[PDB]
Design a protein around this nucleic acid. Structure first.
Ligand SMILES: [K+]
Ligand SMILES: [K+]
Ligand SMILES: [K+]
Ligand SMILES: [K+]
Ligand SMILES: [K+]
Ligand SMILES: [K+]
Ligand SMILES: [K+]
Ligand SMILES: [K+]
Ligand SMILES: [K+]
Ligand SMILES: [K+]
Ligand SMILES: [K+]
Ligand SMILES: [K+]
Ligand SMILES: [Mg+2]
Ligand SMILES: [Mg+2]
Ligand SMILES: [Mg+2]
Ligand SMILES: [Mg+2]
Ligand SMILES: [Mg+2]
Ligand SMILES: [Mg+2]
Ligand SMILES: [Mg+2]
Ligand SMILES: [Mg+2]
Ligand SMILES: [Mg+2]
Ligand SMILES: [Mg+2]
Ligand SMILES: [Mg+2]
Ligand SMILES: [Mg+2]
Ligand SMILES: [Mg+2]
Ligand SMILES: [Mg+2]
Ligand SMILES: [Mg+2]
Ligand SMILES: [Mg+2]
Ligand SMILES: [Mg+2]
Ligand SMILES: [Mg+2]
Ligand SMILES: [Mg+2]
Ligand SMILES: [Mg+2]
Ligand SMILES: [Mg+2]
Ligand SMILES: [Mg+2]
Ligand SMILES: [Mg+2]
Ligand SMILES: [Mg+2]
Ligand SMILES: [Mg+2]
Ligand SMILES: [Mg+2]
Ligand SMILES: [Mg+2]
Ligand SMILES: [Mg+2]
Ligand SMILES: [Mg+2]
Ligand SMILES: [Mg+2]
Ligand SMILES: [Mg+2]
Ligand SMILES: [Mg+2]
Ligand SMILES: [Mg+2]
Ligand SMILES: [Mg+2]
Ligand SMILES: [Mg+2]
Ligand SMILES: [Mg+2]
Ligand SMILES: [Mg+2]
Ligand SMILES: [Mg+2]
Ligand SMILES: [Mg+2]
Ligand SMILES: [Mg+2]
Ligand SMILES: [Mg+2]
Ligand SMILES: [Mg+2]
Ligand SMILES: [Mg+2]
Ligand SMILES: [Mg+2]
Ligand SMILES: [Mg+2]
Ligand SMILES: [Mg+2]
Ligand SMILES: [Mg+2]
Ligand SMILES: [Mg+2]
Ligand SMILES: [Mg+2]
Ligand SMILES: [Mg+2]
Ligand SMILES: [Mg+2]
Ligand SMILES: [Mg+2]
Ligand SMILES: [Mg+2]
Ligand SMILES: [Mg+2]
Ligand SMILES: [Mg+2]
Ligand SMILES: [Mg+2]
Ligand SMILES: [Mg+2]
Ligand SMILES: [Mg+2]
Ligand SMILES: [Mg+2]
Ligand SMILES: [Mg+2]
Ligand SMILES: [Mg+2]
Ligand SMILES: [Mg+2]
Ligand SMILES: [Mg+2]
Ligand SMILES: [Mg+2]
Ligand SMILES: [Mg+2]
Ligand SMILES: [Mg+2]
Ligand SMILES: [Mg+2]
Ligand SMILES: [Mg+2]
Ligand SMILES: [Mg+2]
Ligand code: NA
Ligand code: NA
Ligand code: NA
Ligand code: NA
Ligand code: NA
Ligand code: NA
Ligand code: NA
Ligand code: NA
Ligand code: NA
Ligand code: NA
Ligand code: NA
Ligand code: NA
Ligand code: NA
Ligand code: NA
Ligand code: NA
Ligand code: NA
Ligand code: NA
Length: 254
RNA sequence: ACCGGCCCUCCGUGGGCUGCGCGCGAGUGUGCCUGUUUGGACCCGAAAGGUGGUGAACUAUGCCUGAACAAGGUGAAGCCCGGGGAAACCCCGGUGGAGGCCUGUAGCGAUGCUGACGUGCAAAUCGCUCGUACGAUUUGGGUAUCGGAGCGAAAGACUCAUCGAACCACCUAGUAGCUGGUUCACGUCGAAGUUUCCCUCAGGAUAGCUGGUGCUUGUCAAGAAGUAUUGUGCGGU
RNA sequence: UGCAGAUCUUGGUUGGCGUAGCAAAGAUCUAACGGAAUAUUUUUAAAUGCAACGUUGGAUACUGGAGCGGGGAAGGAUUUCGUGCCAACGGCACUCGUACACGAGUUGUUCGGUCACUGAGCACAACGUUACACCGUUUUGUUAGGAAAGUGAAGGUGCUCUGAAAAGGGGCAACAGAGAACCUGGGAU
RNA sequence: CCCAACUGCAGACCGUACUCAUCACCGCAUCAGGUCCCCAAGCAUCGAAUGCUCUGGUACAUAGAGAAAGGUACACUCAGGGAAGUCGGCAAAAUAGAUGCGUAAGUUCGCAAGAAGCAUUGGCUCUGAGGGCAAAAAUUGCCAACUCAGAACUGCUUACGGCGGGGAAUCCAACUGUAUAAUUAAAACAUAGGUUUGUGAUGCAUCCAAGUGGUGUAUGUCGCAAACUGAUUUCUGCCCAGUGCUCUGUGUCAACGUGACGAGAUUCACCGACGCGCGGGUAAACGGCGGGAGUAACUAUGACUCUCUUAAGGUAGCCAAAUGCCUCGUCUUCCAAUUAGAGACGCGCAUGAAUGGAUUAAUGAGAUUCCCUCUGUCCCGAGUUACUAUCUAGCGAAACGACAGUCAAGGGAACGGACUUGAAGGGCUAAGCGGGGAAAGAAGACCCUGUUGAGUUUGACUCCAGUCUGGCUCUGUGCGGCGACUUACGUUGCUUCACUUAUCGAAUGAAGAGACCAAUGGUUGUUUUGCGCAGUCUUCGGGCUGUGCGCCGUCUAGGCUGACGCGUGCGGAACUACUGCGCCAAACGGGGUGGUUCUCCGGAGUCUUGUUUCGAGACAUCUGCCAGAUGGGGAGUUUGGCUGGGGCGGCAUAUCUGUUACACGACAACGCAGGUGUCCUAAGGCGAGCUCAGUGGGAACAGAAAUCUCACGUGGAACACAAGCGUAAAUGCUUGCUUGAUUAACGAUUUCCAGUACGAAUCGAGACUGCGAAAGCAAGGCCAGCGAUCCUUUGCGAAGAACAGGAAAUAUGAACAAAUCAUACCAGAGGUGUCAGAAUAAUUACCACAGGGAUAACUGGCUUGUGGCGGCCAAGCGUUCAUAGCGACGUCGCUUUUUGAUCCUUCGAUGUCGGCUCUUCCUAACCUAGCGCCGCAGAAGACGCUAAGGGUUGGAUUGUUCACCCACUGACAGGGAACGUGAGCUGGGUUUAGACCGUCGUGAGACAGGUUGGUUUUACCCUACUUGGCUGGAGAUUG
RNA sequence: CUGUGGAAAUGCGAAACACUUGCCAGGUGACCCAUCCAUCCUCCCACGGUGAGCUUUCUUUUCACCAUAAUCCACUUGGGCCUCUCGACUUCUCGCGUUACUCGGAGCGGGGGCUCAAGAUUGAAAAAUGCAGCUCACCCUACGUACUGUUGUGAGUUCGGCGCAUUAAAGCAAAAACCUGGGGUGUU
RNA sequence: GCCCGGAGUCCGGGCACCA
């Protein structure tokens, strides 16, 4: 046979991200001495749109801690951010929408976004259009905090990780029907080469495990093992169950 | 009878087997022809397999930076002015110019005549007719992804007239129980398509039929005869 | 070391045969001149030198500005110009020619490129891997466990010492992007 | 030294001609193909449509003459009828601009829509409406542009170009789009909408020979990766038994470990993970979703009942549907007539629910039926034009070419140009034509064979990457817990917890770590910080253990309490406010030392048993090496034979009996009738006694059949089994005793046969025996019942005796000895049934090669069962009467228009159904001519004779031949000619590649099932035929 | 005096309104459709002067031409802003404006000003050029010399108005080079 | 063939195959 399309994407030749018009990575500011002992004040200068992303971004301007110069950062904007607003980051920052605080300084039951999973990672959780986390409890003996992720899972992180108060802007994006193949064409223009999609049963036996036959059909169960080699692992991978879901859903993941 | 080897018995000047043994040597070197075997192997011929390199100017898809798209039809939202009504709200006339909207040039395609040509203008072209024509649109240059690999709105399509595995050189004069060929004269002889075994049934080995070289002899006849006679046996058509 | 055949190899010759044809894009006519291509006869004029070629004037007609108009890129590289010339070539013809021969022609402070920008991208150095570099990384601000700055602010001396500040090696990739100081007339071919 | 206005001098390098295309580029070429950019006039007109023209550019494409046939056309017209043509309205005709009026069902309310349909349109002369700019303003004056609406008069030959035909229905796909360059544009793909799965980064998917390597990821669940269905509306039923996927506590599974016997190799015991088994879940995972009886007041049907059975027994819906074999189903409608269309019905070979069911407005170069208009598609053809062909001037090929070119019959390799017999035939030739040359092209692609392949699949055989799992190593420090070992003290195997230096993850331009707040810290230190107590050692110098006291060692914003003590705190000087945009750098000062110059110290806290900082941490998410499972993701190879083709079937593949078999022996077929892969310690061996099957006469229950008795009884019984042969004081039956079913020095021979092996059998010699009084019989059950090389495995070569290897002691392990281990020689056993003995699953319609007429699918040839057409005899039918007309039970033929049987010709090719067109032949006579006969009154008919000269139709449905209806007629006969006729046509069907459905298969795929779409090439040669001309010749050229 | 004028929008240029690659911050480069108005230019008309065409009859007629490069100097239309009006919708429903989807106490409109963009006019260049006519005029062989002439309210047309500027789950590259300012140096 | 388990021993499992 020939190589399956799932394996060909791993080479990454014509299937890499389109990033010519992107503005760069969106991160919180570097954790330094000032943020660990006091607070730094910044000003929101502009709200900008980046192709391939749903949530808007904010340009915040700070003063350099040690030099006579200005530092410009690029972050994911929470809902309610406006131009001219003052942003405070540090252990002594107050509790308000748009501030960045250590997780141990936020009262249980608050809504946060842009949460670090490692101290100094500069934000890796709850970054999509309308997502947020919820603080559940603090453990002062071990200095750890418990969070509820947008997927419904619970995670424990060190209390020195930072987070932003509020929810990400741009929510409710997936509620509008697309109605046209042309609209999907423009949506994927800024992400990567992955659309349109051809079904496996419509291909030939040389290309896909589902191809071939005088009728269009899979001839074997479509649930495939976790240990299957690449080129054989297509269909529903290591599925614990199949079919229409009746009742309360279970929590996805491991 | 003797030499070597394996044995049996009543244990003898018994017995019975076995050797590519002995039994007054015949070998060895060289020339030449014929036969068997390996090699390119009497001459020409596959579909395949492997090692290393060259191609995205045809064509497939992504990216960067440029260019292009007559003339009409229909008439969405928003806005204006009038009426009706207790209200809620409803109605007419304008304006405006939306749409993977319609007719239709250029452009991009290729439905029918199963038209023309069919040793052509052409190793796919020509004529009418036909699809679409502000969009998932057409197009220049640059750049990125390939050979058990690349790319594909998927037809096993396309990757320089080559693709159900490209091209170039080499291993390679690849192997072929199968098809084709195989160059002077006269003379003496002259067949078989049957038996047994073989993954054997388009092929071999084996016996038979044939040729050559003879050996030992005889000469009217040995171990002669596809025939009779006499005698003596066999038989169930 | 002897050939009649292997859809055998390489040359030459051959009937078919002066045959099949040389039928898309409408079309030419006339006088004069040129040319060896005539108005060519011994044995009145027609019935015995046909047919065809270039230039100029006139006539007729086509292309019909999405042109058999005027300029460029890719590609080609003397096909450009003058004079001469008709053996072979332009599947008919040639006195014509993008044919053949002999000589000529391309001029920039300002036009295009470059000096001198970045893009999709490439891959020297450094490091790592490989039996073997002919392998990998090398723009998400950016090489390398990584000492890659050779520049020089204020100040002193005299008419040339001491040192503040600057993180992230060296290149290439656009003749349609960025950039770029000149216009008309000519009797000047 | 800086500058303004001038001025003086100098301004480097490469490109520059021409072209950019119906002749300069790529297509072998000056090729009707292809190739990016800029400039773009006048009139008609909505106009870059189309037609004509000024500027600029061309007259370059081989020409002249000129009404043959047949052709091509970006050329036309036809009376009357109007699809009767055809598979099919293919092709052509036809509608058409603008303005006014008007417009159906259905519908997602947007559309459908230009729905459908009616009317007007020329020319000329007039009239009205629609505006700007000025002024001392419902006024006056001046002036531009081309639309719209009317009136009178007058005319038509309906008159350029350009420009939708329309309607009623069924099937499929929602729509725009894509897509097999060069035979398929579609119902296929995509799409929006819907559902499911994995996954919180040390992740999921995944590239890669390898590394601190790479992609989705410049990302973070409203995300990324992997599948299925295919808009909206209304819905999506039951099954977890099978296969798969997935989640939890003890049988089995490997290395590594831990112990034993032994001198050691060897061997044994215990321990030992994932996985597989057990136990759950899961169908919008692959898939699946029944039989048989009876039963209601006429019959029918069966609401009802019973029965067998499943994991569940097809629910809502829909149907002779692109799915129904029978089948042209049955009823209605459409027509004069319908294998067609529509609407109904449903025990549906084999419909059915995201392998999606049902329905749908709009859309479609998609499939099908009907209607209006229109027509040369047809009845049935005719006339005209331009370019060819035709003749001439110039120029000038190819294909093909054994040799050649008149027929009839015959035989022949079964369809001759050549051969046999007959019949024609003077020579040369121009234009046509498609009967023959089984004409040309291409070593048949269909079918079969080869110990040839390739693409694809999986439950084939043998393996490899990837994933998971165990062991060791990487690997360090303490305090404990639970066991083990050996005579409570020492090691060790697992572990709880606390550490940090190995290692791992992340961030940062390695940008402020920890302490100073003080110990179950260290105190051998940069330039001289140690001092005691107790115990115990000593090289007599001083150590070690445990303890104390000094030293290392130290500052600070704020806030409480009594400058200065104590506690707290832990490195701190921040506009408010409810939410909204200001500037900050290259040091001021102050001390010490130098002469208000130059330097040090603060401003700006000190220190470092040292790690850049966080997180984890001796684990794995790390490195390497062994071990196990999984693993069509990938590699390699295989997938019997015979055969009235091959396949399915069968075994004629190794073997036994009777017959074919022709009176020695031998003899074929997928010939006939039957057997074999076993069974028996007795069913083997011997001695003795006896006589079987059956029949007849007799005896309580007792009978046709129980047991007893007498007689006859040539085997009619028995002998394991198939059959044949054989046997009577026995080869049979009963009984007694036994192990000849052992060993048997390589003795010889028969059968098959090569005079090989294997199996079976025959005649002997030697040992020890059995039964017999003995002679004698017996080393299986008479003849069928079985197996090479290599490899594995068992038995025999006991103990002693021999001054030496001998008649009589098995041999070797090569320098030699002791004990193990291994090997050799002889006789058996574990098996090859394809049986003289390879280790082996499918598919190809995407297909390939070498060959085969040794072999199938057409024609032809032999045959004629079957099909068709006839005779002879005469039981009966015919009011009686065998024979007007028929004729059973039987029997004799003919034909090659059916289909079978065979395999002779053709596989380096003879174009494979039907229709259209055209000619000819046959007679078994439908009509037409003339007759005989009747159950012939007339009329209409039945049967038969001579006779093939003439004739033999128009339509609906279907690809059809065939079939069946409507209508006309004198009649609507049957057949042949390579199942006449494709270089004559057509291409509907059949039979490639695309795609859908049903059934089958795990799958790739299959179906003589249904459906839609799918290049038809060449004549100029010879002959034949049709016309057209030139010209010799009687010794048919001469005598 | 130590740049300077104006209450303000912001103006003033012979050389001190000098320097600023120590440093920092902005901007230009730099990107967006369609409608409407519309540049350079083209085509039509009107006005008429040079030469040709036709003229049996008509035609104050038909045709050709009628031009101004770069560079430099000195009233309109549109946008933004300042000032005054002791500042408008006080009051049953205010006002300005576009073909068009709207704007105003966070300051409409009106008078007067400042500034930007696109044009108009005037002049230097520039008539000395170019194009036609005459060329039996005045010459002779010279490319020879004199001389004459030199309106649009139309219809098209992307330069510009024009962007924080299009459908948008689509939101329209970057850098060199250059410009200005904040601080600082400098003149008295 | 090995390990088992359940009945001198027949079945059910998990493994292993040079005549
Ligand atoms: K040889
Ligand atoms: K190539
Ligand atoms: K429109
Ligand atoms: K309709
Ligand atoms: K369209
Ligand atoms: K299509
Ligand atoms: K199509
Ligand atoms: K289509
Ligand atoms: K001629
Ligand atoms: K000629
Ligand atoms: K000629
Ligand atoms: K012929
Ligand atoms: Mg990238
Ligand atoms: Mg900062
Ligand atoms: Mg397909
Ligand atoms: Mg596969
Ligand atoms: Mg298929
Ligand atoms: Mg070869
Ligand atoms: Mg091979
Ligand atoms: Mg290309
Ligand atoms: Mg259209
Ligand atoms: Mg054709
Ligand atoms: Mg296919
Ligand atoms: Mg050879
Ligand atoms: Mg031969
Ligand atoms: Mg002879
Ligand atoms: Mg064999
Ligand atoms: Mg020769
Ligand atoms: Mg000719
Ligand atoms: Mg021709
Ligand atoms: Mg013309
Ligand atoms: Mg020529
Ligand atoms: Mg030349
Ligand atoms: Mg780059
Ligand atoms: Mg440029
Ligand atoms: Mg330049
Ligand atoms: Mg051409
Ligand atoms: Mg007009
Ligand atoms: Mg045109
Ligand atoms: Mg036009
Ligand atoms: Mg020509
Ligand atoms: Mg007619
Ligand atoms: Mg008529
Ligand atoms: Mg018909
Ligand atoms: Mg048609
Ligand atoms: Mg209606
Ligand atoms: Mg109409
Ligand atoms: Mg469609
Ligand atoms: Mg379409
Ligand atoms: Mg095609
Ligand atoms: Mg749906
Ligand atoms: Mg649907
Ligand atoms: Mg199940
Ligand atoms: Mg049905
Ligand atoms: Mg049907
Ligand atoms: Mg019909
Ligand atoms: Mg079914
Ligand atoms: Mg279901
Ligand atoms: Mg189905
Ligand atoms: Mg459409
Ligand atoms: Mg279509
Ligand atoms: Mg004949
Ligand atoms: Mg012949
Ligand atoms: Mg062949
Ligand atoms: Mg064979
Ligand atoms: Mg395989
Ligand atoms: Mg005999
Ligand atoms: Mg015999
Ligand atoms: Mg006896
Ligand atoms: Mg015997
Ligand atoms: Mg197919
Ligand atoms: Mg044959
Ligand atoms: Mg042949
Ligand atoms: Mg042929
Ligand atoms: Mg033929
Ligand atoms: Mg026949
Ligand atoms: Mg035929
Ligand atoms: Mg044909
Ligand atoms: Mg035919
Ligand atoms: Mg024919
Ligand atoms: Mg078909
Ligand atoms: Na799809
Ligand atoms: Na399907
Ligand atoms: Na399916
Ligand atoms: Na459209
Ligand atoms: Na042969
Ligand atoms: Na042109
Ligand atoms: Na460059
Ligand atoms: Na050109
Ligand atoms: Na030409
Ligand atoms: Na589809
Ligand atoms: Na299951
Ligand atoms: Na049903
Ligand atoms: Na029907
Ligand atoms: Na750091
Ligand atoms: Na066979
Ligand atoms: Na017969
Ligand atoms: Na007759």
């Amino acid at each position: 046979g020939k190589t399956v399309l799932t394996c060909r994407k791993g080479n990454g030749s014509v299937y890499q991200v389109h990033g010519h018009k992107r503005l760069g990575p969106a991160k919180l500011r570097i954790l330094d001495y000032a943020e660990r002992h006091g607070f730094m004040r910044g000003v929101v200068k502009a709200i900008e749109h980046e192709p391939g992303r749903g949530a808007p971004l904010a340009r915040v301007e700070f003063r350099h801690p040690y030099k006579y110069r200005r530092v410009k950062e690029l972050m994911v904007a929470p809902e309610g951010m406006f131009t001219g607003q003052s942003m405070l980051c540090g252990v002594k920052a107050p509790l308000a929408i748009g501030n960045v605080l250590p997780l141990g300084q936020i009262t249980e039951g608050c809504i946060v976004c842009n949460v670090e999973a490692k101290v100094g990672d500069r934000g890796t959780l709850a970054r999509a259009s309308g997502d947020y986390c919820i603080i559940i409890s603090h453990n002062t003996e071990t200095g750890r905090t418990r969070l509820k992720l947008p997927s419904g899972q619970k995670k424990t992180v060190p209390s020195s990780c930072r987070a932003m108060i509020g929810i990400v802007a741009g929510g409710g994006r997936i509620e509008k029907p697309v109605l046209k193949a042309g609209n999907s064409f423009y949506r994927f223009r800024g992400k990567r080469n992955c659309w349109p999609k051809v079904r496996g049963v419509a291909r030939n036996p040389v290309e896909h495990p589902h191809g071939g036959g005088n009728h269009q059909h899979i001839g074997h169960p479509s649930t495939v093992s976790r240990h299957a080699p690449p080129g054989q692992k297509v269909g529903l991978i290591a599925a614990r169950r199949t079919g229409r879901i009746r009742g309360s859903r279970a929590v996805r993941g491991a």
